[PDB]
mmCIF file of C-alpha atoms (C1' of nucleotides) and ligand atoms in Angstrom:
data_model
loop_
_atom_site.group_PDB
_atom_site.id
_atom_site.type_symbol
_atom_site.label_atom_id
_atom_site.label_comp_id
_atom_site.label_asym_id
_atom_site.label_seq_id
_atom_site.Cartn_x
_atom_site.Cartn_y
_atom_site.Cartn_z
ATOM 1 C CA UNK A 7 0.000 0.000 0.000
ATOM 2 C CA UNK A 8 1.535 3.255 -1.075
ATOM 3 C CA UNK A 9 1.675 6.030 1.315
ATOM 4 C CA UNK A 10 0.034 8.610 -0.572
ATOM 5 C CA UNK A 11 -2.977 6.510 0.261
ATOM 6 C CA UNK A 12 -2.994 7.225 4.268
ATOM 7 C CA UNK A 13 0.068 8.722 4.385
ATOM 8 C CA UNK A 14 -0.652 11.984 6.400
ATOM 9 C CA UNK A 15 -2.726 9.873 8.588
ATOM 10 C CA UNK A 16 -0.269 7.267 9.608
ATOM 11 C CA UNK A 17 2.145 9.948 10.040
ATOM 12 C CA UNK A 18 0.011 12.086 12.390
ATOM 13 C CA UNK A 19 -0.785 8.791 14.395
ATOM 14 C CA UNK A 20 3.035 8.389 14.264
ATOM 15 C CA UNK A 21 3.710 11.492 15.748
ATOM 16 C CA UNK A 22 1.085 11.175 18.133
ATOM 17 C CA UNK A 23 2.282 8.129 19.766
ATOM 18 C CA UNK A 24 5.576 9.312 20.195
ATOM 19 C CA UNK A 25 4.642 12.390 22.214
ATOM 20 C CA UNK A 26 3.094 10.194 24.683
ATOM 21 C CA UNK A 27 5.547 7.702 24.925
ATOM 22 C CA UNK A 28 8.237 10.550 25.309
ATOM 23 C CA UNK A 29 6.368 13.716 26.709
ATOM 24 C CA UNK A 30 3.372 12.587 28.432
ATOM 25 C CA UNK A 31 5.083 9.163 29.497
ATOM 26 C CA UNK A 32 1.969 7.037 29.188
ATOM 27 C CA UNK A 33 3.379 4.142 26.906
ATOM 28 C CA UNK A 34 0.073 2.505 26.597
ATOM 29 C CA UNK A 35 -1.467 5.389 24.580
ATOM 30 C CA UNK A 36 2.053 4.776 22.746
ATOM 31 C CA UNK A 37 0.897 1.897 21.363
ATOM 32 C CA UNK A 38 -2.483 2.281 21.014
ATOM 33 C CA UNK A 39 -1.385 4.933 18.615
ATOM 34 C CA UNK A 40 1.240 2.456 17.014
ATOM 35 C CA UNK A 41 -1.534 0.202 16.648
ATOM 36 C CA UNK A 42 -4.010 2.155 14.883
ATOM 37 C CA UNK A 43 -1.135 3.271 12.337
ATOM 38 C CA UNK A 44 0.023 -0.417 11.466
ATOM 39 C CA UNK A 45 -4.177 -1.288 10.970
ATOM 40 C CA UNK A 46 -4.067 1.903 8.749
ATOM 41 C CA UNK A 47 -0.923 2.023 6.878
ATOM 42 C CA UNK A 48 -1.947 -2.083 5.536
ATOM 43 C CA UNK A 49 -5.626 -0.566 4.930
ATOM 44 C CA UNK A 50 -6.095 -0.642 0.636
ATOM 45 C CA UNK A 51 -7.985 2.090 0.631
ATOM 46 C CA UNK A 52 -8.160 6.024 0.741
ATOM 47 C CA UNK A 53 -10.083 6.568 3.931
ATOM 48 C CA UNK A 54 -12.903 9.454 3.447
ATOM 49 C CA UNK A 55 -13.824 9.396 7.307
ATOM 50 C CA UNK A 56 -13.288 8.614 10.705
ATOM 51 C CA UNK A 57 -16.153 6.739 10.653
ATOM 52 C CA UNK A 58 -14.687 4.165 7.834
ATOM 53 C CA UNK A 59 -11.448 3.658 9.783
ATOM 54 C CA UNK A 60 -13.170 3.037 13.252
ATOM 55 C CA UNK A 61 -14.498 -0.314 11.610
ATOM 56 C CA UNK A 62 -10.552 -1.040 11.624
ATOM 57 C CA UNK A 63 -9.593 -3.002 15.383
ATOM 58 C CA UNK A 64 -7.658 -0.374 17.024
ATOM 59 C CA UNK A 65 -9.215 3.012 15.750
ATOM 60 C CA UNK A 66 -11.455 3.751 18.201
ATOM 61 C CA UNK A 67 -13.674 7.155 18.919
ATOM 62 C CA UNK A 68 -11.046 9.753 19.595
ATOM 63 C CA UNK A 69 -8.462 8.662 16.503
ATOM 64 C CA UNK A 70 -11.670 8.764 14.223
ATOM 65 C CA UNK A 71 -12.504 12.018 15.523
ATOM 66 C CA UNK A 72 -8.929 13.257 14.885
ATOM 67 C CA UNK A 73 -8.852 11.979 11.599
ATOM 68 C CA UNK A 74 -12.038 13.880 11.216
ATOM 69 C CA UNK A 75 -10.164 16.653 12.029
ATOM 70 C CA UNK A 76 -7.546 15.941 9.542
ATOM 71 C CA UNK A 77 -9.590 15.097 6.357
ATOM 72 C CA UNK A 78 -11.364 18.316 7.019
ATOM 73 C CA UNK A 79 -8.693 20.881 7.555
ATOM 74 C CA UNK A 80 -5.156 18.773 6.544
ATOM 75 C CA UNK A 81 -4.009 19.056 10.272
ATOM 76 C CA UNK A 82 -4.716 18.390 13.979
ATOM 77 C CA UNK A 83 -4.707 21.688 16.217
ATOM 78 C CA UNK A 84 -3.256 19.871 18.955
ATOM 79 C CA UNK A 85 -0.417 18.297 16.581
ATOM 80 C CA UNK A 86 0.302 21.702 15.376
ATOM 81 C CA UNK A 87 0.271 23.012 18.892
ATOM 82 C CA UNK A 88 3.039 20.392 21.000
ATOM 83 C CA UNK A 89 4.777 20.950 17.485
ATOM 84 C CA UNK A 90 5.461 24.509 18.522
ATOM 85 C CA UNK A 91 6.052 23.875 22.395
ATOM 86 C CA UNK A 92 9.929 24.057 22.847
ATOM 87 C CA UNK A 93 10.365 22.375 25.980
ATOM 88 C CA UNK A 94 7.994 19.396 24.783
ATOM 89 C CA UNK A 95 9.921 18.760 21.004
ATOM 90 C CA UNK A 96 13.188 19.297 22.439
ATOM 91 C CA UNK A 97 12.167 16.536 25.371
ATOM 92 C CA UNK A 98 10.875 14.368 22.345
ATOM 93 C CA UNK A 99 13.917 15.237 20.323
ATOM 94 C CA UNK A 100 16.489 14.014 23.079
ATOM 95 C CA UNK A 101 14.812 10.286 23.320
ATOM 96 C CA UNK A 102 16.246 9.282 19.662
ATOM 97 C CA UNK A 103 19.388 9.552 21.634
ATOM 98 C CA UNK A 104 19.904 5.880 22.605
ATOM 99 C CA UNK A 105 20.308 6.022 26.237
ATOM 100 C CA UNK A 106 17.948 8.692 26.493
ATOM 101 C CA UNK A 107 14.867 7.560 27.580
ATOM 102 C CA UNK A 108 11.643 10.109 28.377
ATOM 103 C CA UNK A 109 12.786 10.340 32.069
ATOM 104 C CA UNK A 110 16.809 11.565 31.023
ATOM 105 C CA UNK A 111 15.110 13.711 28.311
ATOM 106 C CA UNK A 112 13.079 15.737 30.853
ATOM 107 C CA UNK A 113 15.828 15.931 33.118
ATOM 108 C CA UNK A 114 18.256 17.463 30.534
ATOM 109 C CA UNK A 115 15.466 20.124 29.309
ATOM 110 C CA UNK A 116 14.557 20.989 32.190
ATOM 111 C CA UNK A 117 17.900 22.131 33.194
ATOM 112 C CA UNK A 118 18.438 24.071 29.970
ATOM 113 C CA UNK A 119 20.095 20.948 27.576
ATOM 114 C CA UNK A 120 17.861 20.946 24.998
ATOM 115 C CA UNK A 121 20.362 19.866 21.843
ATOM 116 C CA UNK A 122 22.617 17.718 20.441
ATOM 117 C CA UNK A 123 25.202 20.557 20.416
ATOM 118 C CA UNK A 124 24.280 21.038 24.575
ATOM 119 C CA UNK A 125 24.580 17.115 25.281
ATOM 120 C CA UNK A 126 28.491 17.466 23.819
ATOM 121 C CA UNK A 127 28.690 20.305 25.773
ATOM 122 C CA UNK A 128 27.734 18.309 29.029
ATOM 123 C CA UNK A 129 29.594 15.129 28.506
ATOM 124 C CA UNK A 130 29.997 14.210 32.298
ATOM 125 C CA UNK A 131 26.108 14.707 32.691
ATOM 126 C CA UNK A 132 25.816 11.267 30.464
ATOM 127 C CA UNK A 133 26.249 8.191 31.489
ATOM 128 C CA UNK A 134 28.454 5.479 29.576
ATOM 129 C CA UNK A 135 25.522 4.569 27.616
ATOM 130 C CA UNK A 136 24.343 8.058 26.523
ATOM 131 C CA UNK A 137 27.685 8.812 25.373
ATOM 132 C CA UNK A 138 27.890 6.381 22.796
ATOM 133 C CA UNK A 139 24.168 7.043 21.354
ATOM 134 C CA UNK A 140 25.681 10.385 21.176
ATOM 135 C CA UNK A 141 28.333 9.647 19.414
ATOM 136 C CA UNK A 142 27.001 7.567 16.726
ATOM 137 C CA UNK A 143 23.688 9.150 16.774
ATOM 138 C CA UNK A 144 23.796 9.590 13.212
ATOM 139 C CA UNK A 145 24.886 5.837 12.381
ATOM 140 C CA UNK A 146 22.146 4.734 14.527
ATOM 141 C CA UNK A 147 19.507 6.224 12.647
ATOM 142 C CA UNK A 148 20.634 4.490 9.392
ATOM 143 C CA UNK A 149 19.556 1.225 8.382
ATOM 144 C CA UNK A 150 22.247 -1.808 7.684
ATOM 145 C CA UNK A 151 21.603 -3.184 3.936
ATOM 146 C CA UNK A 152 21.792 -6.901 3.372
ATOM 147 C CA UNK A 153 25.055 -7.062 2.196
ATOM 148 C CA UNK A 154 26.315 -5.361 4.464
ATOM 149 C CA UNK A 155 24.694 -7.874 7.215
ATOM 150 C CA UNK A 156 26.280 -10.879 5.451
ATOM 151 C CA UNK A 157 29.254 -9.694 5.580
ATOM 152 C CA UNK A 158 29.251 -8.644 9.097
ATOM 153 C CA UNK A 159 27.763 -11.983 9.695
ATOM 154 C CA UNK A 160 30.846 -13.892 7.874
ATOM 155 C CA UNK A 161 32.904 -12.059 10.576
ATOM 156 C CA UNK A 162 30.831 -13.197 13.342
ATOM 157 C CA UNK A 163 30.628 -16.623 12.257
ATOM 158 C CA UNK A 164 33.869 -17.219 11.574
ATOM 159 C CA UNK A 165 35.730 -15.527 15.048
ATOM 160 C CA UNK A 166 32.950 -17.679 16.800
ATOM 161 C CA UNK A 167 33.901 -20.379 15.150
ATOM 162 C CA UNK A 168 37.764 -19.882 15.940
ATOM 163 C CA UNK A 169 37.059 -19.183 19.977
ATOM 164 C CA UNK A 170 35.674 -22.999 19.817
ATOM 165 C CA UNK A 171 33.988 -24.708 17.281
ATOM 166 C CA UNK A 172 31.762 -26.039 19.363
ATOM 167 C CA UNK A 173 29.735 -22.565 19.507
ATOM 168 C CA UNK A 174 26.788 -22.503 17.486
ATOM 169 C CA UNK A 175 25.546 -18.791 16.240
ATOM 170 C CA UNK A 176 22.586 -17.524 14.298
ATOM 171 C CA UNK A 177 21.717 -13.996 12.963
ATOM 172 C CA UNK A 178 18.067 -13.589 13.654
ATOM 173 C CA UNK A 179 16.095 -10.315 13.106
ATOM 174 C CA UNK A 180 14.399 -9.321 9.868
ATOM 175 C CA UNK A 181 17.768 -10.614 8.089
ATOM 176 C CA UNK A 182 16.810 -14.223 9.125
ATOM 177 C CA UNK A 183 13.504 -13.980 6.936
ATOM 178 C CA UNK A 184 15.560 -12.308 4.166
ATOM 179 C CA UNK A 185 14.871 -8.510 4.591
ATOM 180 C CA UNK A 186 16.740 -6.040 2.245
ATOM 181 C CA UNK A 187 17.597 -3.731 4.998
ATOM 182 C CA UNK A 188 18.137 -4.531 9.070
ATOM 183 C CA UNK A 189 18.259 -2.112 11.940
ATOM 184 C CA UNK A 190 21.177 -3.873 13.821
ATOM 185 C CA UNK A 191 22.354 -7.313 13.960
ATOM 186 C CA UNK A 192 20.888 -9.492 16.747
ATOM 187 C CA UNK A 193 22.914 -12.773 17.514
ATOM 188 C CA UNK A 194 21.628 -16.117 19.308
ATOM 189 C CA UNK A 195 24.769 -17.693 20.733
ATOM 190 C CA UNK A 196 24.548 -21.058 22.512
ATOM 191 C CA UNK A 197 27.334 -24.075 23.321
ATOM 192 C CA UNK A 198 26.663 -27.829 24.386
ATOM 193 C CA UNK A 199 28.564 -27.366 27.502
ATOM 194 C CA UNK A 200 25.459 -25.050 28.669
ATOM 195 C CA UNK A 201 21.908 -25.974 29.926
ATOM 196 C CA UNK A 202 19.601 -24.500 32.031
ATOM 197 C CA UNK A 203 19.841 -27.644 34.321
ATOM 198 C CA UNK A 204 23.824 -26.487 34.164
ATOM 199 C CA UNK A 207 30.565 -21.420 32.574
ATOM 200 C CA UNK A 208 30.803 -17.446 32.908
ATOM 201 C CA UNK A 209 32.750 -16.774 30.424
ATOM 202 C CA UNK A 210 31.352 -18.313 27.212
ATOM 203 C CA UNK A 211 29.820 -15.007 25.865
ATOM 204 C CA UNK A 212 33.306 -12.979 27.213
ATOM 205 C CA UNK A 213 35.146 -15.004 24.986
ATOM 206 C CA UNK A 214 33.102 -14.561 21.952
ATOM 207 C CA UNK A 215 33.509 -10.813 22.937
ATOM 208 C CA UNK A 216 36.473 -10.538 23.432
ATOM 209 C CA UNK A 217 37.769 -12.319 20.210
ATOM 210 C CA UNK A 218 35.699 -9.953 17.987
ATOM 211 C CA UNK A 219 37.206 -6.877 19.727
ATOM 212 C CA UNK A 220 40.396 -8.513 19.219
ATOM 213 C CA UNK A 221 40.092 -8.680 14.980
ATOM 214 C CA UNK A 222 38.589 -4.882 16.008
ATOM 215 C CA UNK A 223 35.332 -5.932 14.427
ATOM 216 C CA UNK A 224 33.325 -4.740 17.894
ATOM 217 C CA UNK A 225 34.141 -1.020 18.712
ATOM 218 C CA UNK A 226 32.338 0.212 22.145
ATOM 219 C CA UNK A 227 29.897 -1.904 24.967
ATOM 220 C CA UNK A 228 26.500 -0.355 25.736
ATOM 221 C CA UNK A 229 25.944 -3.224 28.443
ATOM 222 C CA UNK A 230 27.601 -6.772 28.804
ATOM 223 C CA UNK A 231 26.783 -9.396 31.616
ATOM 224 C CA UNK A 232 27.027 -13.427 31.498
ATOM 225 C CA UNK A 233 24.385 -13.665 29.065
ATOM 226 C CA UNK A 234 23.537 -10.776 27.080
ATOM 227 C CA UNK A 235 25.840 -8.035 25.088
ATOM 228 C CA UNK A 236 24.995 -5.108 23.632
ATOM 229 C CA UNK A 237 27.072 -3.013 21.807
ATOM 230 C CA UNK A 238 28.558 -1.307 18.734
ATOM 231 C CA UNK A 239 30.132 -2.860 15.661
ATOM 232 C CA UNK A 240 31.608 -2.079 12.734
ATOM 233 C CA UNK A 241 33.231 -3.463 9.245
ATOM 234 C CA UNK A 242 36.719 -2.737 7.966
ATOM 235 C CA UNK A 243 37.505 0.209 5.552
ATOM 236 C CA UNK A 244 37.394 -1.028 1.817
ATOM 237 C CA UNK A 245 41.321 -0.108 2.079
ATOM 238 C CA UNK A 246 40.892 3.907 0.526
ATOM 239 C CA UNK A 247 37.282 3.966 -0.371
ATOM 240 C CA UNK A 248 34.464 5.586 2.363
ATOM 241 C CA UNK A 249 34.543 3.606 6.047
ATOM 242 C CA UNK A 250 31.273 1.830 7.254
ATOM 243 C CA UNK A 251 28.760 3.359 9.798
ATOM 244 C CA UNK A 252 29.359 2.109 13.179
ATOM 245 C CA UNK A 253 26.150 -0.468 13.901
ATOM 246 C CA UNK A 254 24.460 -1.971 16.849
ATOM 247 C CA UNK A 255 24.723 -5.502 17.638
ATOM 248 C CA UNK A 256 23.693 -7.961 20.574
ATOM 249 C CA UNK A 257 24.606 -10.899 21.713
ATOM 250 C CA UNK A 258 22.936 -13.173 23.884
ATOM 251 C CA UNK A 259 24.052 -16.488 25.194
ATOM 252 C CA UNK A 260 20.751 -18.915 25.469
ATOM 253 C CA UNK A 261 21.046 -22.862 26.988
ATOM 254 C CA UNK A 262 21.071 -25.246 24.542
ATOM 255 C CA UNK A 263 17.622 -26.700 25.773
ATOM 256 C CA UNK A 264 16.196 -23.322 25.133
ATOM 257 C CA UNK A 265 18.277 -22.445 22.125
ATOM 258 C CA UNK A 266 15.908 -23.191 19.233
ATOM 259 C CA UNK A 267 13.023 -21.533 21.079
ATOM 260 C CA UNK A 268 14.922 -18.341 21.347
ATOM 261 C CA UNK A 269 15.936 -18.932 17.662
ATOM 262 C CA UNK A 270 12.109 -19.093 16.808
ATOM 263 C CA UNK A 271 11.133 -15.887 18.920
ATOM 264 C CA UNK A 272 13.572 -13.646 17.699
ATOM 265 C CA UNK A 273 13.295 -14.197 14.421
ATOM 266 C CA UNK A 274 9.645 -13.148 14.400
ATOM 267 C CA UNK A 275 7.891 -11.393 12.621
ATOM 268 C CA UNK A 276 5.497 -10.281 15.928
ATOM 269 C CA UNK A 277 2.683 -10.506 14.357
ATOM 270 C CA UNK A 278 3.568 -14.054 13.474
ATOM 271 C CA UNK A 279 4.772 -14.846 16.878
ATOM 272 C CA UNK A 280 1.375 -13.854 18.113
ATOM 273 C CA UNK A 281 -0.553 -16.003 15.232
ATOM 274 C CA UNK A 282 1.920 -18.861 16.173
ATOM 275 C CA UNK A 283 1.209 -18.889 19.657
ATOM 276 C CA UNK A 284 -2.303 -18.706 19.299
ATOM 277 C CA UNK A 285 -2.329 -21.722 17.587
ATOM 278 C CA UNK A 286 -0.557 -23.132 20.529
ATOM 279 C CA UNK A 287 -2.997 -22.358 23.200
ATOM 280 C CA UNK A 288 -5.869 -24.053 21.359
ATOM 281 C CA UNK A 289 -4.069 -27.097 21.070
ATOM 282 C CA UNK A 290 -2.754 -27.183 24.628
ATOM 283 C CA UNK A 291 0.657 -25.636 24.725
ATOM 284 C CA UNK A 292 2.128 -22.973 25.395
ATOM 285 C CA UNK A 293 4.998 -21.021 23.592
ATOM 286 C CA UNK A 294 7.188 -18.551 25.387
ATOM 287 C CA UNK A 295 11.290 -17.066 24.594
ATOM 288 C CA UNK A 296 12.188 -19.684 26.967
ATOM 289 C CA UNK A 297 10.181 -23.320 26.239
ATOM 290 C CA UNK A 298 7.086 -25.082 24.750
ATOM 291 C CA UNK A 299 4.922 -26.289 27.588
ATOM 292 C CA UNK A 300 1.391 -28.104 27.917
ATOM 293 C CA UNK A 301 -1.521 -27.562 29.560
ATOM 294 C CA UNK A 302 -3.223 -29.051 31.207
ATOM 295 C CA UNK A 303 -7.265 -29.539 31.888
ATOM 296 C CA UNK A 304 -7.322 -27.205 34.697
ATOM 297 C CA UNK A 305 -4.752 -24.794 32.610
ATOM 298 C CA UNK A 306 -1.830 -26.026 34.659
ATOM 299 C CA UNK A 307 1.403 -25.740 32.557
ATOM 300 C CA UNK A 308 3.612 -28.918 32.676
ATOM 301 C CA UNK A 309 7.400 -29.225 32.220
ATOM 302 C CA UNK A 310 9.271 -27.489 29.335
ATOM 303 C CA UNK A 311 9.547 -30.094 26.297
ATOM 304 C CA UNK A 312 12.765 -31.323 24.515
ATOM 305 C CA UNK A 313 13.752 -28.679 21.285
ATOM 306 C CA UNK A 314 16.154 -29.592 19.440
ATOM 307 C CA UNK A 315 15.384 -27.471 16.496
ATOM 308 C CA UNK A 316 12.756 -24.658 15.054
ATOM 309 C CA UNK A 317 11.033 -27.998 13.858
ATOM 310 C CA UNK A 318 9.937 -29.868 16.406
ATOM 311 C CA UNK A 319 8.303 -26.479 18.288
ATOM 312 C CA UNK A 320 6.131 -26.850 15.011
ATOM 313 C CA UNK A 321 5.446 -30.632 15.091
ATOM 314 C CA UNK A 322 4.105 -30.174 18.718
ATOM 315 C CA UNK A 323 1.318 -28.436 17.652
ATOM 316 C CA UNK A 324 1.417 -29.780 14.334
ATOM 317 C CA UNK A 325 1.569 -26.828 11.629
ATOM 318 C CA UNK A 326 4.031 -27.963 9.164
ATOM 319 C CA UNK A 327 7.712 -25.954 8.978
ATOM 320 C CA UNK A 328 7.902 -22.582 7.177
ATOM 321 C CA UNK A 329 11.058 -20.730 5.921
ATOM 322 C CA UNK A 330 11.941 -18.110 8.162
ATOM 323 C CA UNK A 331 10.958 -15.855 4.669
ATOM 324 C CA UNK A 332 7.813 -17.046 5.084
ATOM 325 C CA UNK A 333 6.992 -15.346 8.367
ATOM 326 C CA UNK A 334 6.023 -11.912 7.927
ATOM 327 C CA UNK A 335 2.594 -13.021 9.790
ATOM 328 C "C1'" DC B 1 -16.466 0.369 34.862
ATOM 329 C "C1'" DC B 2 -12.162 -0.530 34.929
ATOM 330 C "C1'" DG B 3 -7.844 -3.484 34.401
ATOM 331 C "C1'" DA B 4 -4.636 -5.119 30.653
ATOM 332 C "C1'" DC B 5 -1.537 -3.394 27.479
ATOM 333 C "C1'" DG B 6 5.224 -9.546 27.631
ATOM 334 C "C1'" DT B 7 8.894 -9.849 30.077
ATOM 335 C "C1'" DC B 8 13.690 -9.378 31.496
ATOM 336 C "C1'" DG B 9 19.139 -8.349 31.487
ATOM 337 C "C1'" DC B 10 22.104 -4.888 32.587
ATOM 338 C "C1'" DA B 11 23.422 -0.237 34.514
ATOM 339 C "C1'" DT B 12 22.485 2.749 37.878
ATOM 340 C "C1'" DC B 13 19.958 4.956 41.448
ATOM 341 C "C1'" DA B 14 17.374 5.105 46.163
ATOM 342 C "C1'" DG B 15 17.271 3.528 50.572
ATOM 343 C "C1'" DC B 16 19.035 1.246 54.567
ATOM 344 C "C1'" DG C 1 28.328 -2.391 51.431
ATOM 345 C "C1'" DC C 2 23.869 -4.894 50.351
ATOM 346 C "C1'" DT C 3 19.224 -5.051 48.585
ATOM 347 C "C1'" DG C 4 15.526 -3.623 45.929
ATOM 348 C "C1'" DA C 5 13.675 -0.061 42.655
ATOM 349 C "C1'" DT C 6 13.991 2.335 38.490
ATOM 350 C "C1'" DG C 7 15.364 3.618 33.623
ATOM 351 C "C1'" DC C 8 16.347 1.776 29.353
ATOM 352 C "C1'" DG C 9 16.230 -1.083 25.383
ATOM 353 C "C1'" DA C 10 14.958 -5.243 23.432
ATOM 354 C "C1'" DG D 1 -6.409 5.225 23.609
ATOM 355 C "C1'" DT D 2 -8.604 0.900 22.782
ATOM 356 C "C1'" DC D 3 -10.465 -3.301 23.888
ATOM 357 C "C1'" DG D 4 -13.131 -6.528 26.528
ATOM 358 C "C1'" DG D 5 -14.615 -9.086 30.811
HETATM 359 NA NA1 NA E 1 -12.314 -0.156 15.921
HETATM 360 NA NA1 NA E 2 16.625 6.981 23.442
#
DNA sequence: CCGACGTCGCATCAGC
DNA sequence: GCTGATGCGA
DNA sequence: GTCGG
């Protein structure tokens, strides 16, 4: 569906849900915003009235009315207004800083840092974290294209590889189903010596080996079982060097490997269709583990995954290709 | 009418 | 110094 | 803000 279509609607709802997640701090309107836009923006049709797009689950009576608004005049007063407000877009502006979340964001306006320009000018205001969102705040907000993702997954695989070959890695994400373009690069990192019925250092090894061949440049966070960080490719010897990109790494038991594998791979919306399926024939599908209920609706113990497979023979839909999982 | 709206790892703060 | 709460991102 | 028990 082109944009054109409900472009300036989606938009509006857009912008609307990020005020309140990062002004007005209610996250729920947030996504009750979100929500409407998705319903919208995959709606083939030019909507003529609020009326139409209230039949639409998730456009209720106030996003009608403001898309009332909107058909009639081409705006929303009260978009126009917070547009204006300096304190509020400066607070909203602050929160694409990663790092800066709606709480830091009214902190720093409200004691005069309001820019990008006046968070370099307070460095020891920011914590570690801040410091690198403001740093690559501009690589951040650009997207990763496939090639790109290969080969910073031929990197990953083979320095994992090298630590012990033993590991076992998989780039999940969009990338997994075969999108053009990813956000960052999320890894799933898991080793037989590991169960949940089970060392602290297999994900500082990994790590460390891919800071060693310089491939990872700065840590946003790093425990026993989850890294998150920055990354970024080599320079093409004279030609233009790579933005820096984020990338996590989590280490999962092998028990609950292919589970994780499943989840974060996605898409959500098939996540939610494939767990649906799932409660009505008596199991239940988490990050973690496939369980079963249960007459009364008592969950049992987690069963034995060895593979995305047999979490779909369990409730019996046959496999599909992670490409095949938009919903 | 009114509660749900995933859950959790890590960093850091608030309180003792 | 330890313990639990909070902010943040996922 | 929306949905639903
Ligand atoms: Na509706
Ligand atoms: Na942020």
């Amino acid at each position: 569906p082109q944009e054109t279509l409900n472009g300036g609607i989606t938009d509006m709802l857009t912008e609307l849900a990020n005020f309140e997640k990062n002004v007005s701090q209610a996250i729920h309107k947030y996504n009750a915003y979100r929500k409407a836009a998705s319903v919208i923006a995959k709606y083939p049709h030019k909507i003529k009235s609020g009326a139409e797009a209230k039949k639409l689950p998730g456009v209720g009576t106030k996003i009608a009315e403001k898309i009332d608004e909107f058909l009639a005049t081409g705006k929303l007063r009260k978009l126009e207004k917070i547009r204006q407000d300096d304190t509020s877009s400066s607070i909203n502006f602050l929160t694409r800083v990663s790092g800066i979340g709606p709480s830091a964001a009214r902190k720093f306006v409200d004691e005069g840092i309001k820019t990008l320009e006046d968070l370099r000018k307070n460095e020891d205001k920011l914590n570690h974290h801040q410091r690198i969102g403001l740093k690559y705040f501009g690589d951040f907000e650009k997207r990763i294209p496939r090639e790109e993702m290969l080969q910073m997954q031929d990197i990953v695989l083979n320095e994992v590889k090298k630590v012990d070959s033993e590991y076992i890695a998989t780039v999940c994400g969009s990338f997994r189903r075969g999108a053009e373009s990813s956000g960052d690069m999320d890894v799933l990192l898991t080793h037989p010596s590991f169960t949940s019925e089970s060392q602290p250092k297999l994900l500082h090894q990994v790590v460390e080996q891919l800071q060693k061949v310089h491939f990872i440049t700065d840590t946003l966070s790093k425990g026993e079982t989850k890294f998150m960080g920055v990354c970024q490719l080599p320079s093409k010897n004279d030609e233009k060097e790579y933005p820096h990109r984020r990338i996590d790494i989590r280490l999962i038991p092998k028990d609950q490997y292919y589970c994780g594998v499943l989840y974060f791979t996605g898409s959500d919306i098939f996540n939610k269709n494939m767990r649906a399926h799932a409660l009505e024939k008596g199991f239940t599908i988490n990050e973690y583990t496939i369980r079963p209920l249960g007459v009364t609706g008592v969950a049992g113990e987690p069963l034995p995954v060895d593979s995305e497979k047999d979490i779909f023979d369990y409730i019996q839909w046959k496999y599909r290709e992670p490409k095949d999982r938009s919903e």
